[PDB]
Ligand SMILES: Nc1ccn([C@@H]2O[C@H](COP(=O)(O)OP(=O)(O)OP(=O)(O)O)[C@@H](O)[C@H]2O)c(=O)n1
Ligand SMILES: Nc1ccn([C@@H]2O[C@H](COP(=O)(O)OP(=O)(O)OP(=O)(O)O)[C@@H](O)[C@H]2O)c(=O)n1
Ligand SMILES: [Mg+2]
């Protein structure tokens with residue numbers, strides 16, 4: 291079985307809409323509901339735990355809450371929100387951590403991440419070739435190097451894990467700042483396997499990204 | 512003089528339109544015309560050299576040829592196209608190499624690149640922190656490491672250079688694979704300075720990208 295943990299507790303500062311980003315609409319439906327729909331449509335998710343902004347917990351339990359759909363208060367940062375949500379994950383052998391902000395993630399991608407876990411990988415992350423050339427820079431913006439593009443991946447969510455591995459990794463988390471779950475698992479020396487991602491699993495962060503997402507939804511309508 | 516070189520001689524295989532990408536329309540206008548419009552709006556570009564597929568050289572001179580724009584036949588790959596365009600740049604102080612596919616590149620971004628060159632940087636590239644976490648992977652796609660995202664930039668165009676530095680680099684360029692001009696200059700350890708890019712300067716590559724570009728254009732047109 292697979293449980294999805296959905297961090298949806300951020301304030302959406304960069305989205306500029308005056309409300310937490312999970313509750314901004316896309317085609318008239320909140321981003322959170324899009325993310326939940328993708329998870330349910332994949333057919334491979336047995337349980338969902340959603341971390342929401344703390345003040346909205348009670349209202350969220352009423353709107354989004356249900357038997358296989360558990361609301362928890364989120365934390366100060368994404369790492370804390372995921373840690374809190376893991377307390378409610380239950381006994382599923384696999385955990386997928388999926389940003390509510392990646393609202394148009396295709397159910398296909400979710401299914402592929404679970405399939406790779408079931409195959410035997412302990413940690414599975416979707417990734418794509420970076421669209422732009424990546425350069426390493428120093429603190430003043432001077433280029434230090436241009437890593438080989440073929441060996442880089444821009445990663446997305448859901449990031450999938452054997453549950454025991456993810457719990458171990460989060461039990462070692464310190465201070466936060468990290469918003470990539472795989473990084474915590476890498477610190478245990480657990481192998482992390484990249485699988486093909488999907489350009490539609492982009493993270494909605496700014497008003498431009500929402501314009502883009504509206505365009506995608508309208509084009510696939 | 513600041514000269515922009517625009518390689519536009521590619522076939523656009525990944526756009527899957529069956530015709531060269533720079534001539535595919537966006538909002539009723541070829542990507543190339545959008546890119547030229549941005550360069551002109553910046554008010555910092557003196558002239559432009561455009562490399563186009565040899566077949567379309569004559570037509571292109573009629574459509575895009577101008578008092579400030581010269582059309583030349585491009586090459587089999589981007590590197591050759593840039594080299595051929597450099598032949599026609601004249602006595603430039605600065606050369607900016609700009610991908611026509613980044614059709615919605617803001618003029619302020621173009622001006623930032625030129626401004627930094629005038630400050631005395633030999634090589635200047637626009638960039639932003641990557642929107643996604645970047646991982647290094649081995650041949651099987653297993654993670655080798657996660658570089659500090661804050662120390663990475665996803666770079667864009669125009670890439671700006673002191674003309675002599677770029678010309679010396681292009682003299683020893685290898686044909687094929689090389690589509691980041693700064694990388695060529697980096698081979699010698701020439702310093703390259705990042706200036707702020709802009710999410711609008713995305714490279715139109717796929718059918719999806721073009722759908723997105725149409726939507727951006729519509730959004731900003733009131
Ligand atoms: N304290 C937090 C911060 C973030 N998130 C979640 O982590 C995902 C990725 O975060 P991000 O895209 O940064 O969203 P926000 O933090 O809401 O946006 P911003 O950083 O612009 O304020 C989002 O689904 C967000 O709701 C969370 O659950 N708890
Ligand atoms: N032989 C070539 C190949 C590419 N370019 C130019 O370089 C820019 C970036 O290249 P890319 O986005 O890869 O465009 P294409 O090569 O046309 O697309 P594809 O690789 O999908 O065929 C484009 O403006 C393109 O016209 C060029 O001048 N000469
Ligand atoms: Mg955030």
Ligand SMILES: [Mg+2]
Nearest residue numbers: 521522523524
């Ligand atoms: Mg190409």
